[PDB]
């Protein structure tokens, strides 16, 4: 409801939205503020226009005041050009006059005047105070390069402190910032309740934090935690314009030390004291309602001559008022714009109607022109161009606090030289190093909730829980990733063991049934002793056969016994060695033929010791063999059926089965990998049946005494060795030992040694007794 016409038609008046009521403003600011800033603005205006050559010498000076508030706020916003355009009231003898109000203070408090100015076309935002959204952007900009995931929040009842917390709420998610707590502190807070929230603070273990509390609001907060003396704590004191003012007590920085906070350096107003000294009781021709509030705040029963010094010096608490400096800069910018349009080029604007920028102004549309796209360079600050989002933004002094043992106080460091606006850039401009607080501890090495676990692992996530907290769980078997903290766990090469990562390998030692290890030595010793005894029995045989008793007995019998032992032992030697498919083709028929002809020699010895008889006729064959050809062809027919069935399974399809080991996980052993070998089992069974034959001829040998009782030994040795071989063959066929060490080899070598001990030893003794054989 105030109305302050002043030097020039541009009249910077109207009700100030920062005041919400007559009583509010009377007992909030004026009772001890009090509207002196506009007096300083008018000073600057008057001597600047004396400096200027007739800047705007059009209208006069006059102050008339009459003090929700929306009705009178808009009514004081009402100029006179709006209510006299046509307005043909027969009783209104109106005349042309144009005032125009621009200044708005406390715009955040009341937005109805802003809406009125929007609808009328006279919108003028200069809140001239920089908004807290830029401070939230700055706190985010210090979030990224700290390289830390979550952070805590503390707020208060301040109206300006809310938009920061909501903005943090909608910006945290897209760049994984987690919030553990965000609680309000009032002017007075309960004791046990504050203890409860701080207790859940230690419960949360969210050590990094940002506080939006004001000075008197944060003073109790620094007070309570002194009692328990937990002092590893770091803060982020935003909007810390009054840095170390209410926290200046000693032993407090033992808890609240090392805090980094934003600040704005404010240029001191030249002659502020003498600016405020001019107001005196009842010598004031202008601003009569300055006089009324002076009367009503100092009730006027008495006190009609006191000065400001006589009053209780109300100019110590506010040495430099933020709103005063902001409106000072705003009015300076407006005056500079007025000077500019007084000295602008001859040219026109962008608007269609009201395009009259001359010595006489129409609706003050050039002022917004010079605000939007022109520099200011006022009050030794070098201000940026006025913008809607940010009016006048300077370099934010991110101050750091250091304890001073020599002074017992806090020293400030301008090491933070940065701003979020695009005047210097969107990137980093902060100095991080060469500072300390009881050591180098602000890096907070354990600010991340989860650690970098060992390679090959999932940072398993709790469902419905922020991605910051992850616990590491081990990748499935046979799969391992190289670098740590790998979400895409990948397959690992099969060349290493579990190697503290639970991996798998396929390349290991391969059993070739012969190695430098002692089993190979033992089997080689058995083989060489067998070969040596075969050589010795060959020598004794060649000794026996040199005598002319040859062809009086059957030399072919012993000759084929020697061939049988040689081939059966050759099969035993072929049994060991590196196993492949070609070795199996060279081995299996050899095994079959060795078995069948060794056993055929046994049978031909058992059935008839002496020569066979047959008819004497001339045929294709020779005559001297005296019937041995039938025994030869019987053994031969066995040999054929064996090798022809061998070639039958050869040419049809090579006998290769699936590659199998003892265990597919860690054991890689090459085997025969041939197959079931049904016909091989059939011929083995036929050989066993042939061994079962000629038992009764062995019995016809038990009755009669033959050649001084040698065939009985053959008979019982037959029995015992055949049964032991047939009892130990399925153990080899079933037991796992065949992989580690073949049992068939030892079984067959023992059987062959027994078979030779059946007759060779006995008749060697006999010929040692009687050489005539």
């Amino acid at each position, epitope marked *: 409801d105030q109305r302050a016409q002043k030097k020039g038609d541009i009249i910077l008046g109207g009700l100030f939205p920062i005041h919400f009521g007559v009583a509010a403003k009377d007992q909030d600011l004026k009772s001890r503020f009090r509207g002196f800033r506009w007096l300083q603005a008018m000073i600057f205006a008057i001597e600047e226009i004396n400096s200027s050559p007739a800047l705007l010498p059009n209208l006069t000076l006059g102050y008339r005041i009459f003090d929700s508030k929306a009705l009178e706020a808009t009514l004081s916003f009402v100029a006179q050009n709006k209510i006299d355009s046509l307005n043909l009231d027969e009783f209104c003898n109106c005349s042309e006059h144009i005032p125009s109000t621009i200044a708005v203070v406390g715009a955040t408090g009341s937005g109805v005047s802003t809406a009125v100015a929007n609808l009328l076309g006279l919108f003028y935002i200069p809140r001239t105070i920089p908004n807290d959204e830029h401070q939230a952007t700055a706190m985010a900009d210090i979030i990224e390069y700290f390289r830390w995931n979550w952070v805590g929040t503390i707020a208060a009842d301040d109206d300006y402190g809310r938009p920061g917390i909501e903005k943090f*709420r909608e910006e945290a998610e897209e760049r994984d910032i987690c919030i553990d707590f*965000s*609680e*309000l502190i009032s002017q007075y*807070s309960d004791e046990e309740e504050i203890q409860h929230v701080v207790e*859940v603070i230690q419960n949360s273990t969210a050590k990094v934090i940002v506080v939006f509390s004001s000075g008197p609001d944060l003073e109790p907060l620094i007070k309570e935690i002194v009692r328990r003396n937990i002092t590893g704590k770091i803060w982020l004191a935003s909007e810390a314009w009054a840095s170390s003012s209410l926290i200046a007590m000693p032993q407090y920085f033992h808890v609240v030390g090392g805090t980094i906070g934003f600040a704005l350096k404010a240029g001191q107003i030249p002659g502020f004291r003498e600016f405020l000294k001019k107001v005196h009781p009842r010598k004031s021709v202008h601003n009569g309602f300055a006089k009324e509030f002076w009367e009503e705040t100092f009730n006027p029963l008495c006190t009609g001559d006191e000065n400001i010094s006589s009053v209780e010096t109300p100019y110590i608490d506010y040495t430099h008022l933020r709103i005063s400096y902001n409106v000072y800069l705003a009015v300076y910018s407006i005056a500079h714009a007025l000077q500019d349009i007084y000295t602008c080029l001859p040219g026109r604007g962008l608007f269609t109607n009201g395009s009259c920028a001359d010595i006489k102004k129409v609706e003050a549309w050039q002022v917004l022109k010079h605000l939007r796209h022109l520099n200011f360079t006022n009050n030794m600050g070098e201000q940026v161009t006025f913008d809607e989002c940010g009016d006048l933004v300077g370099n934010y002094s991110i101050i750091n606090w250091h304890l001073s043992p020599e002074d017992g106080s806090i020293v400030f460091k301008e090491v933070g030289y940065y701003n979020v606006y695009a005047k210097k850039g969107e990137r980093l401009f902060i100095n991080e190093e060469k500072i300390l607080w009881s050591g180098f501890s602000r890096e907070v090495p354990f600010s991340n909730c989860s650690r970098d676990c060992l390679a090959g692992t999932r940072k398993g996530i709790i469902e419905g*829980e922020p991605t910051c907290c992850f616990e590491c769980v081990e990748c499935p078997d046979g799969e391992y990733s190289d670098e740590t903290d790998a979400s895409a766990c990948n397959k690992c090469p099969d060349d290493f063991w579990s190697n503290e990562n639970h991996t798998s390998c396929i390349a290991k030692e391969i059993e070739f049934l012969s190695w430098t290890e002692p089993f190979g030595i033992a089997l080689t010793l058995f083989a060489v002793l067998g070969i040596f005894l075969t050589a010795f029995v060959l020598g004794v045989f060649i000794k026996f056969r040199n005598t002319p008793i040859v062809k009086a007995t059957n030399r072919e019998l012993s000759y084929l016994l020697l061939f049988s032992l040689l081939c059966c032992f050759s099969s035993s030697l072929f049994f060991i060695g590196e196993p492949q498919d070609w070795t199996c083709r060279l081995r299996q028929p050899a095994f079959g033929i060795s078995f069948v002809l060794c056993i055929s020699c046994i049978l031909v010895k058992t059935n008839r010791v002496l020569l066979v008889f047959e008819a004497k006729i001339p045929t294709s064959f020779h005559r001297k063999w005296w019937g041995l050809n039938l025994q030869f062809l019987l053994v031969f027919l066995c040999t054929f059926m064996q090798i022809v069935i061998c070639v039958i399974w050869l040419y049809t399809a090579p006998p290769s089965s699936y590659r199998n080991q003892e265990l597919e996980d860690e054991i890689i052993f090459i085997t025969c990998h041939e197959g079931s070998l049904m016909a091989l089992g059939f011929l083995i069974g036929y050989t066993c049946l042939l061994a079962a034959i000629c038992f009764f001829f062995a019995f016809k040998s038990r009755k009669l005494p033959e050649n001084f009782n040698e065939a009985k030994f053959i008979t019982f040795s037959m029995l015992i060795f055949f049964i032991v071989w047939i009892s130990f063959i399925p153990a080899y066929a079933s037991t796992y030992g065949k992989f580690v060490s073949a049992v068939e080899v030892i079984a067959i070598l023992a059987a062959s040694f027994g078979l030779l001990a059946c007759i060779f030893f006995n008749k060697i003794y006999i010929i040692l007794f009687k050489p005539s054989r």
Partner: nanobody
Amino acid sequence: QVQLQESGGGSVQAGGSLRLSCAASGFPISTYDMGWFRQAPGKEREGVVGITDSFSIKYEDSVKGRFTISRDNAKNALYLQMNSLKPEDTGMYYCAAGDARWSLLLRAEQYNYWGQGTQVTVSS
């Protein structure tokens, strides 16, 4: 950027049970909670129960034994189960969002967000 809708509005007896389920849209509940209050239509809004973003709960003198409140971060919605209710169950359940104190949430006017205020008249 916060939205909510009421569900489970039905009429039961004095000893009957009432189920209320409300799912948030476009706003995770991790940052802050979503308080619920019970206003008799035609008079001032009263807060029977109070949720805390730290998963704490705060009840008035008579709430014990009849109200159960369920809220979780994973599902970001709120359940209100009522049993052995007082005979005059007529009222409107109002949902509010905004940082405040324990007494401030008990009075329930510090919340900036205002819900639609769906009402069910049990009248039993």
